[PDB]
mmCIF file of C-alpha atoms in Angstrom:
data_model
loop_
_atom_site.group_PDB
_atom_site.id
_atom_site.type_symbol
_atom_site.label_atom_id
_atom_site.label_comp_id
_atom_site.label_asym_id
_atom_site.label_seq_id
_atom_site.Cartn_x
_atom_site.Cartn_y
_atom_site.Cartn_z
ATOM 1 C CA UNK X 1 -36.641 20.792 -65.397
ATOM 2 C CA UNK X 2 -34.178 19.595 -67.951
ATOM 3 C CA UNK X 3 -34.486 20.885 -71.254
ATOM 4 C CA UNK X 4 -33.875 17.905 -72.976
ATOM 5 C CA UNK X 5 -37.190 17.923 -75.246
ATOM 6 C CA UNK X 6 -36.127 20.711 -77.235
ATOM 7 C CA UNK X 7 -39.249 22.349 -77.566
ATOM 8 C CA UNK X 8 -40.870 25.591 -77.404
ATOM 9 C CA UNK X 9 -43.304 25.932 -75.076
ATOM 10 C CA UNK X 10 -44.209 29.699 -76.803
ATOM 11 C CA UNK X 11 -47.722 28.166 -78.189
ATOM 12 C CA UNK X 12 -48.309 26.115 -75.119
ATOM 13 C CA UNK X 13 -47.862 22.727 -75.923
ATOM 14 C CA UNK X 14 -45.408 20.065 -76.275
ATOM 15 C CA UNK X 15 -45.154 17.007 -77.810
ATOM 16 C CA UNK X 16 -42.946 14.916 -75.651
ATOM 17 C CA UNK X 17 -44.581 13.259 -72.657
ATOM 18 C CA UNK X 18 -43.344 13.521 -69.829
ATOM 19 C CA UNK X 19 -41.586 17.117 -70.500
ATOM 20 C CA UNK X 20 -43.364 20.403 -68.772
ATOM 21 C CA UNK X 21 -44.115 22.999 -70.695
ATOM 22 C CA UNK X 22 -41.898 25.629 -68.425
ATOM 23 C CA UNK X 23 -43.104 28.866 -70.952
ATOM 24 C CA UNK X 24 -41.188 29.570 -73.335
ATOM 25 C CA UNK X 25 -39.848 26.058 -73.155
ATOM 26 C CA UNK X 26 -40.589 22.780 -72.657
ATOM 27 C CA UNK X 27 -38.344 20.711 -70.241
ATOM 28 C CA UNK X 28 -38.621 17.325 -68.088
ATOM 29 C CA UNK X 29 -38.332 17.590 -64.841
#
């Protein structure tokens, strides 16, 4: 849920593990 990755999740993907890709953005937990 925190946005603490810092990444987009507009192409559906994100690099960090652990972070959800919560479209447009990717946060964990």
């Amino acid at each position: 849920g925190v946005p603490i990755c810092g990444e987009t999740c507009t192409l559906g993907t994100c690099y960090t593990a652990g972070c959800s890709c919560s479209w447009p953005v990717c946060t964990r937990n």
